[PDB]
Amino acid sequence: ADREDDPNFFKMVEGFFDRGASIVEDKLVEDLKTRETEEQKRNRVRGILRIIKPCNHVLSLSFPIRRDDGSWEVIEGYRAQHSQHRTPCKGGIRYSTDVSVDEVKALASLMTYKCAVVDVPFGGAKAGVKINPKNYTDNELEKITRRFTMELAKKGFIGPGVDVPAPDMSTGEREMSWIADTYASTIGHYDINAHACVTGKPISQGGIHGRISATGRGVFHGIENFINEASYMSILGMTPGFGDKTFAVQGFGNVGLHSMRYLHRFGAKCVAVGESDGSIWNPDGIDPKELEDFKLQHGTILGFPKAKIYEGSILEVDCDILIPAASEKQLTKSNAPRVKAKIIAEGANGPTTPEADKIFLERNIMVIPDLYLNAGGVTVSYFEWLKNLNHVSYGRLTFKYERDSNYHLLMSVQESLERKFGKHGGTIPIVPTAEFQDRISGASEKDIVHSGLAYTMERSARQIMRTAMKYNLGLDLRTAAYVNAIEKVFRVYNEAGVTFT
Amino acid sequence: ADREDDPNFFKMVEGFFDRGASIVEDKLVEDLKTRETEEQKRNRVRGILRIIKPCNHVLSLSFPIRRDDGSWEVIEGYRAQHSQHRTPCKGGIRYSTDVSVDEVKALASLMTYKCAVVDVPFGGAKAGVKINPKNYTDNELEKITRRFTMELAKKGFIGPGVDVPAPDMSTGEREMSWIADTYASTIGHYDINAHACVTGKPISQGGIHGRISATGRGVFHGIENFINEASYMSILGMTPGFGDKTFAVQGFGNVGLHSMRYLHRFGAKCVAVGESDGSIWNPDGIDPKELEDFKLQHGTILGFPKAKIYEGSILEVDCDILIPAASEKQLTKSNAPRVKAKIIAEGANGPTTPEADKIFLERNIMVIPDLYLNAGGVTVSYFEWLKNLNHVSYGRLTFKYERDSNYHLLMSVQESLERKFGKHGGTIPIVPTAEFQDRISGASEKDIVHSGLAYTMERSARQIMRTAMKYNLGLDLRTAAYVNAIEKVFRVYNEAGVTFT
Amino acid sequence: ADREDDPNFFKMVEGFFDRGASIVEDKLVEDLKTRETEEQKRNRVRGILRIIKPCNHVLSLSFPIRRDDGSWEVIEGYRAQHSQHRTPCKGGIRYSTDVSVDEVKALASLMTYKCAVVDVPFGGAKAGVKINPKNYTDNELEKITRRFTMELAKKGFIGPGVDVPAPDMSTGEREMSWIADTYASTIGHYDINAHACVTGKPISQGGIHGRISATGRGVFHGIENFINEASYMSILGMTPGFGDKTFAVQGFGNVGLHSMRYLHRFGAKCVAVGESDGSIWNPDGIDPKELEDFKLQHGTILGFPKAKIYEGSILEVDCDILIPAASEKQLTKSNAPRVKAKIIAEGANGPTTPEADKIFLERNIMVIPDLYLNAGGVTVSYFEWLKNLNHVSYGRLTFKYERDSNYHLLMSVQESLERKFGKHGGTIPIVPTAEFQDRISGASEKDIVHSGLAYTMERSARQIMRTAMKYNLGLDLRTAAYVNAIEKVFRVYNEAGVTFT
């Protein structure tokens, strides 16, 4: 992911952390619920922060699997649990040769800070299996994930109340299904909540509506919240709204594909899509549906008819909004001065280096941070988990009751008015509007996911704005986010019996 | 140190492994129970060996502890489990700033190879907590080990049937007691075998006789087995026996102190004792009991009256036998040409580098390998574990029965002879010899430990000699040991169904 | 099996049971520890016996497996637990299309009666998977047994202290290994005794010496105990001993092959070996070692050079002893009048029908019953289980102690005599005989298995003889066996909240 500026992903995130640690250190000694004072309160805060930064647990595994051609192979895997300040750890599983102890630790800590930003009660965790999925058959991949689950289960790295994985790079519903099945068929066979051991499951296996596209939907909302402020767009030299905007996304998987689908829906036009092979381009825009079909049938976006094979880094293309949705450290000190985009919407985790962040602050480029912007995935994963614990489809017990109820409520206003305006008025039909007619039986699963996600992205967005203001951070939203996150994680160690001298 | 051949400890052991892997690879394709043939049998062996080398599990921990002065501190710890080919993993816990992921992995794998050499049914494991014990109070140390136990317990890194720790550098009965107590009071409170979760415990807590001095006793036996062969001493230019031998030990702790006590008992005289501060020397010998008292009262061996402060590396002193009983990589390419000793008895784990091994083979210096020589500790740890599972003091149920039994057996020969040689002979008292009188009621715990250890060290010693011969390895006992070890670990992997038909 | 007499396998055993139930019903009302009397004591015995006959639990399973060619297949399986009067149930696993609910129930009950006869503290159990192993690959078989284990484990039909399987028809070490591995890697991963969940395991996986040939060895002993009584051979018209005897075995697997090996060792000559394809014959005898090689290389005994393909039912061949070691109901009312053999040694379970038993009693043919004769397998399975619970190789802790001990004991007689017969005698070396020299270090695993089995077969044999006498049952050993068995199982009921209250 670079040579000159390839800081260790974990140290990189610690940098992001330490930055916010400075900014809020005062509000913390303030809110510190201690009878002691001065330097002891200053010291205590530092001690607590020193606890939060390092990952509490990291499991490195080396297990064998029998390949299809009879041969034996040893594959490596890791799962790090950054924090248990909130009982169930949460974090996906990545399948890639790029994975390593440090990459996983970094991702794990990003998970807990992001959960805090978005108010999801999970400490962060992350897993990685060092393989290139494309070099294995479906049958070998199944053996790999099922075996990996058991090793995690035996050491306490997976379970409804201990640690709940989910998809990430090169893993999806299929893998999640295998994980759930392995867990429920063995260790959790007596557990009524066995299927809540993992999220991102297929809908038919206890998964939840819109989880696959949840990150993209969330990316849309995160951009929407800022792109409609004017108090922010005036500083970038842009008009609010999506209608006259162009964007380019690096990555065309679960994050990239859906981010693109949603932005295109509200008027923004996709100017370029990138992948590992390369990228494509078209100033008149590219349609998300057609591109997905081409990719689906040909296995690559390159060669797409309604566009041209671009030659010159998808990140440097000319557009209003750049959405890196691939891997980490894609924007560094080297390519940063060349982004051409005014808004960097981080769909991926850690796509920009700290050094690249500076250049972006100088060139007046707004970087909507990953720990807020991509949290739509974990947010809906939280909903999936909750659904598995309740064992019911949201609304099932209340549809008829709320429907009958709303009609009687409306009938109460109708009758009251006919009672008043006796014969003068006549019949005064009080009927639902078309919109309320669709909400007549109350919320369903799909409804809750959508409105719940929009609500979360909005609540957290304001929180970040209020914080950027209170500390005059300008377009340094990342720092505002870590500030909010440290504050929330602090609340748990602080007020807690532990730390009461 | 010395700055020259300071290799990755783990890689170093892998080197030792790969060496033996070559030497036995043929006897393995031979004993391979496969219907297939040629390269497939050759390939299968390589695949299995590739499984055995890497550690299966490594847990890295970062947990906080409240220091005595109220402050918060984060301490790091690790426990690696190299192999589970034998269900309970076994390995000590080291307290040192020198500990790291690699050091622990290396030690862990040495544990499994050593258990195999000595026929103890445990896969290897090892733990390390990165602290210098001397910079903490007893109360802080207790909090550190108890908390470390819980973290290991919750992730499956300690338990009677999963993983059984023991002492190592800077840990002893005290720490083991804390570990047992923490485990038994929490997770294992219902477990009838809870106290078998750890070994090296104080005798009053379920520990076993002679475990503290077990490594020293074993070091004595390992040296005895070779120093009395002539077929080996002729090649070193020495006479068999201990009576006219001198030795120097680097380290004066659990290994060093007892190795010294036992060698001194059979006539060998200790010429020099070394520690981290430095060493002392006296050509007429130093007495183990007096040196221990001085050390006990003054906290250091330096300044001992019946000896002089030596200035010139304890490893280079002039003597017949050198016993490094401290830490790893103490004998390298740099100091090797200067040992002056003909026999290097490795009390410590990995004290000599591979490059140092060559120089030792050329200068015709016999290196009695660590995976055999120091295994007296694990061997007796195995006895402690067995004792905890049986819940009885060895002999308690049989003392009176065997005593009465032996007298009637002896009376049977007495009466038979008086019956024959009627009045010619007269009374023909058949009485035990003084030695048999002490064995009249059968073995006690102490008896089983001593005779069990001697037996083990002897059985394994012959096995190594037979192997050094079969492959003409000369004074390369280390390689003979790994050969024996790979052979034994191999057998659990071979078997049909296991690595598959 | 016929169309004439092919009684229901279960009903058939109930018949055998009811027969003995009558014979001992009186000694039971006698030994009944009741204050009440007459018919109430008579009634209570009947009630208890009504409890013992039916199997307590039977699990029928239907689970899918993915065949190698991608297709899906549903396989059927069952495991019955006849009695829990002794906590761990014990019984093998059969792979055959002949398996069914009734066959397994019958086998299960035979297991508990046989364990009682042989004094092994296990209630009986049995499993069967309805497949012909030859129509599946090794990989499919592995999936089949591993999946079957999990289904049994989840419903409490396998575990160290609940139910311990073992081999039977078409299953061996390999399958047992898969079972142990599946159990220990999942449900029993924390269990220190996980590997005792099954027996008949490969030696390198915790199996025990001589388990494979244990049934054959036991068959030898069972025949030996009766063939050397004269008080029994006079009634058959035979001389005691093996030297001048000929035999024919139906079945050349784990039971048949070893029964043949052991009888041939003590002078008896094998005249014919049978299999499903057919049989072979040679009046001068057939050598067990050569026949095994031919079978091993060609997959069939037919066509063996040092013998001829026999055409006429292996059971009707002319010989002194007939050993049916295949499946049940091979000797019925139809072929019984044609056995030509004076002794029927039942290696297999239920090879003779009740109706065939009559004809055998009339023709004065002694039928050494299966519940005694083939119990060598379970007996040694019991030793394997015990070994797994103790986690040590028998003798390992005591070899050197007992060796040193015996020499001092012998030295005590030597010194006592030299003390007496001062200079008259001179040196009076007291040295072990060659035989005692091999027993100098005490018993090893192999020693305990052999001597423990011989002891058991002998103790039970006398018990049966004493019972055949006390009731003048003549050559009706089967009934004597069930009498002994009901007595032992009933004892457990004549005191467990049963006869009481």
Ligand SMILES: NC(=O)C1=CN([C@@H]2O[C@H](COP(=O)(O)OP(=O)(O)OC[C@H]3O[C@@H](n4cnc5c(N)ncnc54)[C@H](OP(=O)(O)O)[C@@H]3O)[C@@H](O)[C@H]2O)C=CC1
């Ligand atoms: N639920 C989720 O999955 C969530 C994921 N995220 C974030 O998004 C990333 C996950 O993407 P998912 O894992 O969603 O993506 P998926 O694996 O589908 O992404 C696939 C795309 O990534 C592209 N890609 C990979 N590496 C590069 C590269 N070096 N340069 C250009 N393109 C590249 C692939 O091209 P190609 O196929 O040729 O390699 C492919 O188009 C994570 O890092 C994570 O932080 C955040 C929240 C939720």
Ligand SMILES: NC(=O)C1=CN([C@@H]2O[C@H](COP(=O)(O)OP(=O)(O)OC[C@H]3O[C@@H](n4cnc5c(N)ncnc54)[C@H](OP(=O)(O)O)[C@@H]3O)[C@@H](O)[C@H]2O)C=CC1
């Ligand atoms: N059961 C057991 O304990 C077993 C131990 N071993 C081996 O021995 C080691 C364990 O020793 P224990 O843990 O037994 O030792 P203990 O801590 O008692 O050893 C204490 C001694 O180690 C000396 N020491 C440490 N570092 C150095 C150095 N760089 N140079 C010179 N001397 C040094 C100390 O000097 P100072 O006090 O000034 O630091 C002290 O005299 C392990 O590495 C292991 O491989 C082998 C088998 C079993």
Ligand SMILES: NC(=O)C1=CN([C@@H]2O[C@H](COP(=O)(O)OP(=O)(O)OC[C@H]3O[C@@H](n4cnc5c(N)ncnc54)[C@H](OP(=O)(O)O)[C@@H]3O)[C@@H](O)[C@H]2O)C=CC1
């Ligand atoms: N641990 C144990 O296994 C124990 C077993 N036993 C007894 O031994 C029997 C088990 O044998 P295992 O199951 O040991 O035998 P294994 O499957 O090895 O027996 C294989 C032999 O059975 C022969 N066979 C099967 N059916 C017939 C038939 N209808 N006619 C002629 N030969 C046949 C086979 O011929 P083919 O290959 O062509 O089918 C083959 O030679 C049981 O009934 C049991 O009572 C008793 C105690 C312990």
Ligand SMILES: Nc1nc2c(ncn2[C@@H]2O[C@H](COP(=O)(O)OP(=O)(O)OP(=O)(O)O)[C@@H](O)[C@H]2O)c(=O)[nH]1
């Ligand atoms: N690739 C792709 N996936 C889709 C599409 N439509 C639905 N899905 C699946 O369903 C989820 C997307 O749901 P949405 O289409 O965004 O739901 P919605 O249309 O916004 O719901 P409404 O606003 O009430 O109409 C993902 O998890 C997909 O698996 C599509 O057009 N393309």
Ligand SMILES: Nc1nc2c(ncn2[C@@H]2O[C@H](COP(=O)(O)OP(=O)(O)OP(=O)(O)O)[C@@H](O)[C@H]2O)c(=O)[nH]1
């Ligand atoms: N306090 C103290 N304890 C010691 C000393 N030396 C050894 N020990 C400890 O106890 C042994 C003491 O053994 P006894 O003194 O009980 O040993 P023993 O039975 O004569 O040993 P053997 O002669 O080899 O059979 C070791 O296990 C040490 O842990 C010493 O000098 N002082």
Ligand SMILES: Nc1nc2c(ncn2[C@@H]2O[C@H](COP(=O)(O)OP(=O)(O)OP(=O)(O)O)[C@@H](O)[C@H]2O)c(=O)[nH]1
């Ligand atoms: N299939 C088979 N296995 C055998 C035979 N002979 C011995 N065994 C084995 O008994 C083995 C170890 O046997 P040893 O200790 O060398 O046997 P012995 O030499 O003590 O064996 P026996 O002659 O049966 O008493 C197991 O691994 C079995 O495979 C045989 O003829 N056929």
Ligand SMILES: Oc1c(Cl)cc(Cl)cc1Sc1cc(Cl)cc(Cl)c1O
């Ligand atoms: O680990 C496996 C082994 Cl030994 C054999 C097979 Cl046929 C598959 C696997 S993967 C796996 C699958 C499940 Cl359902 C459970 C576990 Cl415990 C597994 O390891």
Ligand SMILES: Oc1c(Cl)cc(Cl)cc1Sc1cc(Cl)cc(Cl)c1O
């Ligand atoms: O972990 C500890 C906390 Cl939070 C507070 C205190 Cl006063 C001690 C400890 S150490 C410890 C000791 C035991 Cl007996 C059990 C556990 Cl669970 C410990 O962590």
Ligand SMILES: Oc1c(Cl)cc(Cl)cc1Sc1cc(Cl)cc(Cl)c1O
């Ligand atoms: O049941 C299986 C599934 Cl669903 C997938 C694979 Cl590849 C193998 C099996 S068999 C099996 C093997 C193990 Cl080790 C554990 C379990 Cl519970 C199994 O079902």
